[model samples]
Target: DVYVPDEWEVAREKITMSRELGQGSFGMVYEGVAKGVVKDEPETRVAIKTVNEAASMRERIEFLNEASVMKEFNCHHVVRLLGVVSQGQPTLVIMELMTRGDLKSYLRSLRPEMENNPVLAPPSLSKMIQMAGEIADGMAYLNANKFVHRDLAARNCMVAEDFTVKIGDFGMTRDIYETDYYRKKGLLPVRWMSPESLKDGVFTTYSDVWSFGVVLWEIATLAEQPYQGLSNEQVLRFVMEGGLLDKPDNCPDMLFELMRMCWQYNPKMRPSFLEIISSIKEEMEPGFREVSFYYSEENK
Candidate 1:
């Protein structure tokens, strides 16, 4: 059988599919209106994800794996999976609609460089540190949940209505193939990846930690491209030769140090999520590490 029961199942007629959302590694995404027996509301906005069902057996399995992975997550720092449209040609996984868009866009908007009418803030040190902690928190949940977010990056993260960042893009087609070793091969978004992922076709929670460091740099620099002038080939070569991109001009030395630790040549040397959250967290400042947005998948 090509199917099984998923608790979060949706009927085809309930989803009023709408306009384009954006595209990522899997397939086309659309903004949708889900009308059903809803917990959040009578009619809730969602992002419907689908790929060509006829693509391949592995592609579909990996897609289901993503839903399985997200379904277990009950953390605010992770994205919410609404349900699935199982009985159809092109399958759809409906997810909570993040109106404000991705983390990269969110950071760009905060720039005084004017992605918006007034600057969100003047790159406040506390704000950047706070954002770094949020990223770590999400990774912590994944680490504790027995799954690895092979793709963790700024563009894969979404911002909630209250400016909370939630990690997304749980399943990229190639990632779950051959018991997730397809993660070991692909023309991936290499810039946000660990050396082992690029060098050895491997991904682990440790690899995710490495990418989290890149994301921290992105937040600190207000979404500057990682290794701006370098090509993919050069960046890999540079990593082998004891090299990593320079920190943002105003980025705190403490923040850059974490990024440095994450870019370690040996993935084993990297810190765990417990250590990471502690490293970035400010126990004294309650507001910085706070992610209590009820509208998100916050379990507590």
Candidate 2:
């Protein structure tokens, strides 16, 4: 049965669709208004994701799956799912507004020397570390709840004007794709995937930690492409042999060390999101140290 719990459903009539926000491989996103979502505000701006008119049954299922997964999450650092319009053709998934769009593009938008554009300012080192902590906080919540975010990356996270980053893009499209050895139905986030996910189709909270490490690297590098010169096949081959991404130029040694922990050959050796959050929190404090439990002998 195609069912979203009653509490998560919103009447189709309550939504007023507006300008298109962006489009996904299997869905169309829109900047829309929803009535009664917020009791204080009669009309609340929201982001709406719905399958295309030509969407297939599988695509629709994946879309609904995303809504279901999102319904289970409630965190300030995670994108909030307002409601779903299931009794309709488009199968709307209404979420809180993130006007600035995905974190990848937002990070990519910053130039090294923003003097050319006076209005835009690049994030400071501390600010970038704070953003990584926010993501770790959200992922820790999900990890505690036993939900694995198979697609965790800068491209999958949404950002706001105040630099608030919330995890998004929970759809099965990329997460459920076939292994690289076989031709797949959906696209895979090969670069961000853990080695086991690439070889054995294993996706647990640990694998998410691995992807989060890549996301941290993305933030440090201002969203540079992972494995810059390597082909997807080469990336797969390299990772399977215990290869790790090179440290970004000017990247803090401490942050790169954390990335290495995330890319540990054994998933069990990877640090939990909680541990990552703690390390990042410490890094943000005054008199920051380059060392943490992540580097302690006990960690090994």
Candidate 3:
């Protein structure tokens, strides 16, 4: 049986209704506000995720696992879980609201609007490099804390007005040593799964790194859809057969090398997040200090 939350109030006020935000296979999220608030105070918005009360025991366990993971992870790059309510039959999980929404929508809005037009996307190379570095730092922290974010997809990373990237959706996360019913099944996003994850349902720090590689590709590609025409089974087969995305145009050689290393079949050889961060720092700092025009003329 599903263990639904027993309450639905926000900030100690009842939720009269809510506005739809987004939806996934599991459930739909709605923006909600508390009752009896003044105009100036402007009730702080919260994301209320509603899931069926009748879901199977295994599903409920998964939800609980997600909650546990979120509670343990406290970082600037990870979304914060406010509280949970189960007063009603169906459960609702309240989480911090993201005004800018997910990365997918943000990237779509930025397409072809970049200053360089055809050459570069809205987020310039410098911005991309910075974001990648930030992501690696966050992942490094997570791994260091003994957590494995199994679902590190572009959609799972949310951006704020200040351009901060925070990893969201801990539904698929697991402790590096913890084994659940699904552990044997090896859950993964179809297009983003690491080869080992697809093959044996096993995950390690290296597997997370592999997922990070795919995320880098996604960021560099301006958030292009992954595995457009391939089914989950087909994608899994292809990945196991040594298929991977080609490096996009203008992608730096160092960045591509990092991606290739992450995808290496031997997880032992994958670079640690610390190593990834160091490499990126070495590559980007000099470019930032050098004059762009000087390099441009030198190439000519």
Question: What is the per-residue lDDT of model 3 for residues 1-300, given as tens digits with 9 covering 90 to 100?
Answer: 444443323443455336887663356678876443323654556666666656765765566545644656555566666666545435566676677877656666676764654644356766777767667766776786787877776677777666767677565222321211122254446577778878777778888899889888888777775665666667778888888878877777766787898888778888887778767675444542242211223222
Cα RMSD of predicted structure 3: 9.6
Query: Higher-lDDT candidate among 2 and 3?
Result: 2
- Over 4 Å off in model 2, which ranges? 53-62, 88-90, 112-122, 172-186, 282-300
Question: What is the alpha-carbon RMSD of candidate 2 to the true structure?
Answer: 6.1
Write candidate 1's Cα lDDT for 1-300 as tens digits. Answer: 245757788888888777886664567788889987357588888888887645776776667665655677667677888888767657788888878878877777776763555644456666666666677777777777777877787777888777667776464332212221222246466777677767776789998988888888888887787887887677777765667878888787888998888888788899876687666555314654345332235423
State TM-scores per candidate: 0.77, 0.81, 0.70
| Model 3 bad stretches (over 4 Å) | 1-11, 14-18, 24-27, 33-44, 51-68, 88-91, 113-121, 172-187, 226-234, 281-300
Cα deviation in Å at residue 70, candidate 2? 1.5
Report the candidate with higher lDDT, 1 versus 2.
Answer: 2
Angstrom error of the Cα, residue 133, model 3: value is 2.3
- The collision pairs in model 1 are 184-201
Q: What is the C-alpha lDDT of each candidate?
A: 0.72, 0.77, 0.65
Q: How would the candidate models be sorted by TM-score, starting from the highest?
A: 2, 1, 3
Cα-based lDDT at residue 241, candidate 2: 88
For candidate 2, the per-residue lDDT at 46 reads: 94
Point to the candidate with the largest TM-score.
2
Best by lDDT: 2
lDDT of 2 by residue, 2-78 (tens): 55457888999999898997665567788999999976998999988878898777768767775676776667678
